[PDB]
Amino acid sequence: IVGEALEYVNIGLSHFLALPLAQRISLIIIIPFIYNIVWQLLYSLRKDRPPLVFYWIPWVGSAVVYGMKPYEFFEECQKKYGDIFSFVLLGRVMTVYLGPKGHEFVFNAKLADVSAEAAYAHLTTPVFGKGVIYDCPNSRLMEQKKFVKGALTKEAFKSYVPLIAEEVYKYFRDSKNFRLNERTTGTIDVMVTQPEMTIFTASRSLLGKEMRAKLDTDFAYLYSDLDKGFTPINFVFPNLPLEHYRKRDHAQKAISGTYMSLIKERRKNNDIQDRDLIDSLMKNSTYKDGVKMTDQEIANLLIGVLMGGQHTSAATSAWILLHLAERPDVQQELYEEQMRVLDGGKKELTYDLLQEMPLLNQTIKETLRMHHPLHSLFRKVMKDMHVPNTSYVIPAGYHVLVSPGYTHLRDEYFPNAHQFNIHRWNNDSASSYSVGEEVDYGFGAISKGVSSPYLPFGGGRHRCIGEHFAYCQLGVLMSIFIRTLKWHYPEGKTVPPPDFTSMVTLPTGPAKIIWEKRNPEQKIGGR
Ligand code: HEM
Ligand SMILES: OC(Cn1cncn1)(Cn1cncn1)c1ccc(F)cc1F
Numbered sequence: 466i467v468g469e470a471l472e473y474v475n476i477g478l479s480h481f482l483a484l485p486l487a488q489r490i491s492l493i494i495i496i497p498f499i500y501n502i503v504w505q506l507l508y509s510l511r512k513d514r515p516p517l518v519f520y521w522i523p524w525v526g527s528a529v530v531y532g533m534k535p536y537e538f539f540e541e542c543q544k545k546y547g548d549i550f551s552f553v554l555l556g557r558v559m560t561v562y563l564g565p566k567g568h569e570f571v572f573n574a575k576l577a578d579v580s581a582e583a584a585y586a587h588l589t590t591p592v593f594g595k596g597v598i599y600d601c602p603n604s605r606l607m608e609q610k611k612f613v614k615g616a617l618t619k620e621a622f623k624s625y626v627p628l629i630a631e632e633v634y635k636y637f638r639d640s641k642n643f644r645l646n647e648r649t650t651g652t653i654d655v656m657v658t659q660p661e662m663t664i665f666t667a668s669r670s671l672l673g674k675e676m677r678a679k680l681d682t683d684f685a686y687l688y689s690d691l692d693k694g695f696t697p698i699n700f701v702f703p704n705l706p707l708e709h710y711r712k713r714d715h716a717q718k719a720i721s722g723t724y725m726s727l728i729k730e731r732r733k734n735n736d737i738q739d740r741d742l743i744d745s746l747m748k749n750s751t752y753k754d755g756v757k758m759t760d761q762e763i764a765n766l767l768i769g770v771l772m773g774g775q776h777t778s779a780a781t782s783a784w785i786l787l788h789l790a791e792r793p794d795v796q797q798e799l800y801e802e803q804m805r806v807l808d809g810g811k812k813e814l815t816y817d818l819l820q821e822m823p824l825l826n827q828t829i830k831e832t833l834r835m836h837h838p839l840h841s842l843f844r845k846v847m848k849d850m851h852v853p854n855t856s857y858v859i860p861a862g863y864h865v866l867v868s869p870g871y872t873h874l875r876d877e878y879f880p881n882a883h884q885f886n887i888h889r890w891n892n893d894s895a896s897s898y899s900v901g902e903e904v905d906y907g908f909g910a911i912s913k914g915v916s917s918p919y920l921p922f923g924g925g926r927h928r929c930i931g932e933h934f935a936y937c938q939l940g941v942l943m944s945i946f947i948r949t950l951k952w953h954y955p956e957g958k959t960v961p962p963p964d965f966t967s968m969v970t971l972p973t974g975p976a977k978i979i980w981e982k983r984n985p986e987q988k989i990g991g992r
Contacts, residue, residue, distance in 0.1 A: 497523050498523060500523075501523040502521075505517060505519060505520075512856055513856050513857060513858045514551070514857065514858070515546070515549045515550050515551050515560060515852070515855075515857050515859075516545075516546040516547075516549075516550045516551070517550070517551045517552065517553070517558075518542055518546075518550060518551065518552035518553075520552070520553055524553075524555065524556050525553075525555065526552060526553025526554050526555065527552040527553060527554060528554050528555050531552065531554060532697075532965070532966055533965060533966065534965065535840050535841060535868075535871075535965050536840065536868075536870075536871050536874065536965075539561065539563060539868060539871050540871075542561070543563055548562060548563040548564050548566065548567060549561065549562050549563075549567075549852060549855070549857060551863070555700070555701055557863075557864050558862075558863045558864065559843075559863075559864050559865075559866045560846075560859050560863050560864065560865050560866065561865075561866045561867075561868070562852075562865065562866075562867060563868065563871060563872065564872055564875075564918075565872070565916040565917070565918055566853075566916070567867050567868070568867060568869060568872075568915045568916055568917070568918075568920060568924065569914070569915055569916050570852065570853075570865070570867070571842070571844060571865050571866075571867035572842075572867060572915040572920075572923055572924040572925035572927070572928075573914075573915050573924070573925045574844065574850070574865070574925070576603060576926070577847065577848055578846065578847060578848050578850050579844035579845065579846055579847055579850075579865060580603075580844060580845045580847050581599065581603075581843075581844050581927050582599040582600075582601070582602075582603065582606070583844075583845035583847070584843040584844055584845045584864060585599045585843070586599040586600055587699060587700065587703045588695075588697075588699045588700055588703075589769060591694060591699065591703055591704065591710075591713065591714070591717075592691065592694045592695050592699075592713065592717065592768075592769070592772065593717070593765050593766075593768045593769035593772070594717055594721055594761065594762070594764065594765030594768060594769075595761075595762075595765065596758075596759070596761070596762040596765060597609055597758075597762050597765045597766040597769060598765075598766065598769045603926065604907070605752065607906055607907025607908055607926065608752050608753065608907055608908075609758075609766055610907065610908035610930050611907055611908040611909070612745070612746055612749055612750050612758075612766075613742065613745075613746070613766070613770055613930060614908055614909060614930050615745050615749050616671065616741065616742040616744075616745035616746075617930065617931070617933060617934050619816070622816045622933065622934070622937045623815065623816040623817070625670040625671075625816075625934075625937060625938075626814060626815055626816045626819065626937065626941055627813075627814075627815075628666075628669050628670045629666045629669065629670055629937070629938055629941040629942070630814055630941050630945060631669070632662075632665045632666045632669050632677075633662065633666065633941065633942055633945045633946075634945070634989050634991075635665075635989075635991070636661070636662050636665060637945075637949065637989055638989040638991070640658070640661065642657065642658050642661075643658075643980075645949070645982060645987070645988075645989055646988050646989055649981060649982045649985040650979065650980065650981040650982070651979070651980055652955065652977050652978070652979050652980075653977065653978060653980060654974065654975045654976060654977050655782075655783040655786050655787060655972070655976050655977070655978060656783055656971065656972060656974045656975065656976055659779045659780075659782040659783040659786070660775070660779040662779075662782070662942060663775055663778050663779035663782060663938070664680065664688065664775060664779075665677065665680060666938055666941075666942065667771060667774055667775060667778070667938065668680055668771075670741070670938075671741060671742045671770075671771065671774075671934070672724075672741055672742065672743060672767065672771065673740050673741035673743055673744075674740075675727055676723070676724070676727065676743075679723065684719075684723070687715075687716040687719050687720055688716070688720065690712040690713060690715065690716035691713060691716035691717055691720055691768070691772070692772070692775075693709060693712065693713060694709070694710070694712075694713030694714075694716075694717075695772060695776070695968050696967070696968060697966065697967070697968060717765075717768065720764075720768060721761060721764035721765055721767075721768060722764075724743070724763070724764035724767055724768070725760045725761060725763075725764050727743060728743060728747060728760050728763060728764065729760060731743070731744070731747065732747065742767065742770075743763075743767065746758070746763050746766070746767070747763070750763060770931070773931070774931050774934065774935065776838065776968060776969045777838040777839070777931075777935065777969055778935050778938055778939060780836070780838045780969045780970065780971050780972070781829070781832055781833060781836065781838060781935070781939060782939060782942060782943075783971070783972050783976065784832050784835070784836045784972060785828060785829065785832045785939070785943060786946070786952065786978060787960050787961065787972055787976055787978070788832060788835070788885045788960060789828075789952070790952050790953055790954050790960075790978045791953070791954055791959055791960065792885065793951070793953065795828065795887060796947065796951060796952075798824060799824055799825055799828065799943075799947045800947055800948070802822055802823075802824045802825060803822070803825075803944060803947055803948050806818055806821050806822055807948075810948065814941065814944055814945075816937065819936075819937065819940045819941070819944070822940070822944065823894040824887060824894075825940060825943060825944060825947075826894045826895075826896070826936065826940065827887040827888070827890040827891070827893075827894045828887045828943070829896075829936060829939050829940065829943070830887075830890050830894065830896065830921075831885060831886065831887045831889065831890060832885075833921035834873045834874075834879065834919060834921070835873065835874070835883075835885060836870075836963065836970060837869060837870025837873055837921055837970070838969035838970055839870065839969060839970070840868060840870045840871070840963075840965060840970050841866050841867070841868050841870075842866070842867050842868070842869075842923060842927075843864050843865070843866055844864065844865050845863075845864050846859055846860065846861050846862065846863040846864060846865055847861055848861055849861055850865075869918075869919070869920035869921070869923070870970075872918045872919075872920075873918070873919060873921075875918075878918035878919075879918070896921075896922075896932050896933065896935075896936045897919075897921070897922060897932065899911065899912035899913075900912075901913060901914050902914070906925075906926040907926075908930060909930075911924070911928055912924060948983070949982065949983060949984075949987070950980045950981065950982060950983060951980070951981050951983055952978045952979060952980040952981070953978065953979055954977075954978060954979070955977055955978075955979055958977070960972075961973040961974075961976045
């Protein structure tokens with residue numbers, strides 16, 4: 466009888482609760498372990514679900530292999546399952562869609578279907594501050610992107626180029642890593658030099674002279690603290706009572722506090738011009754519903770834009786130098802282009818002349834092909850999504866993962882994809898280019914289609930707005946490096962593997978190059 470069965474359930478329940486504590490703990494471990502395996506096996510027959518990568522440890526999932534070797538992971542998954550597959554990652558289910566159709570599925574996904582801010586808020590909000598970027602609705606982000614873009618005009622770039630050039634020269638002159646007036650050769654770690662050059666140049670141009678001057682003080686130490694909070698660990702542990710987390714928060718307060726002081730000081734003196742992004746945001750930061758950004762939110766947006774731009778550009782800078790260190794042929798070819806465009810060095814570098822340097826820009830383009838600083842972009846799925854031409858349905862609660870950087874490294878789309886060749890971009894040296902219909906999400910007309918196999922800057926509503934600033938900064942920086950120095954690897958060394966575990970895919974350190982002055986007698990003037 467079924468009556469007597471229900472009795473033995475209750476009996477079994479009471480015997481269960483009365484087990485020796487060791488077997489209880491063991492059952493605490495074995496039961497969800499067994500349940501997990503059984504759940505996957507069952508999930509398999511679901512043909513309205515993409516294949517799920519098998520994993521042994523519950524919650525953890527494929528985190529370790531994804532965390533350490535994401536492209537090798539994607540490649541293995543791809544030839545087993547094809548272009549669409551899911552995997553468990555630290556409690557989340559990630560649905561990957563590789564290739565151009567994946568680019569379309571995720572970057573062009575409707576606003577109602579996916580949320581970037583739900584994916585990233587816990588990473589970024591504690592670092593940047595409240596009320597901006599991912600700590601706000603999408604419509605607010607769109608307009609923040611529009612506000613920042615107002616300091617990213619052609620006219621702005623024309624003024625930034627000599628400021629950036631000045632900083633590069635000052636760095637060559639003053640940094641312990643160079644001191645070109647005293648040394649004709651030396652060794653550097655590019656993961657030391659490039660983050661420093663990147664912060665000095667980006668500060669001077671986007672933040673202005675005051676904020677640049679601050680980096681000549683121990684205030685510079687706060688950026689390091691803030692920098693240390695920008696880490697994937699925030700995806701698991703956003704806030705922990707350690708000193709790492711307190712130094713982060715303290716820095717965000719002191720740094721935004723500093724920006725606010727400058728802001729309120731400019732407003733008090735009515736000293737608001739068109740010098741920098743701070744000026745720009747002081748004059749142009751009213752949303753379409755008439756609500757103004759607070760001084761705090763302005764400062765916080767400044768932090769995030771600068772920090773995001775910081776890591777992508779520094780990493781890219783580092784890779785350019787690293788690839789060129791074993792390619793004296795490319796160094797030579799870039800140098801000839803410098804001599805031609807700048808009339809033997811007699812012409813001062815300008816933003817317009819930068820545009821007349823196709824090989825230089827192709828080098829940047831090719832470096833971003835081989836080293837997309839962001840190997841995975843995420844969205845949280847908010848409504849059930851049907852996968853076109855499939856029976857797959859991606860349920861709300863899932864995350865979608867797109868990886869243009871993976872496609873960058875596929876021979877199908879880039880022959881001999883693991884060879885560095887700037888000439889694969891001959892007569893195709895633009896940072897990117899819309900060549901079909903365009904669309905405006907709030908921050909300017911951008912390409913409607915996002916099916917290009919090359920997407921260093923993403924696409925759709927979350928597309929990068931720093932692409933031309935990045936080319937301007939990298940361009941000026943590399944133009945001066947090329948014209949000033951040659952460099953090569955220490956004996957036996959080559960391009961290092963990427964460190965896929967940090968927030969951007971930095972080179973594994975220490976990554977050293979040996980530089981030498983092209984003109985040992987050349988001196989850099991100024992104080
Ligand atoms: C080589 C350098 C850079 C690369 C490769 C890059 C790449 C990207 C990518 C792939 C995205 C899309 C992220 C997503 O879909 O989730 C993005 C978004 C964005 N980037 Fe960049 N970026 C670079 C430099 C910069 C710079 C210099 C700035 C600021 C001056 C910047 C600011 C932004 C902003 C404001 C967004 C929008 C985020 C959103 O809408 O959710 N980036 N970038
Ligand atoms: O897209 C990022 C955030 N992110 C996503 N994965 C890793 N970091 C990075 N980024 C893109 N360009 C520059 N940085 C971002 C976007 C906007 C922003 F203001 C900061 C920021 F970190």
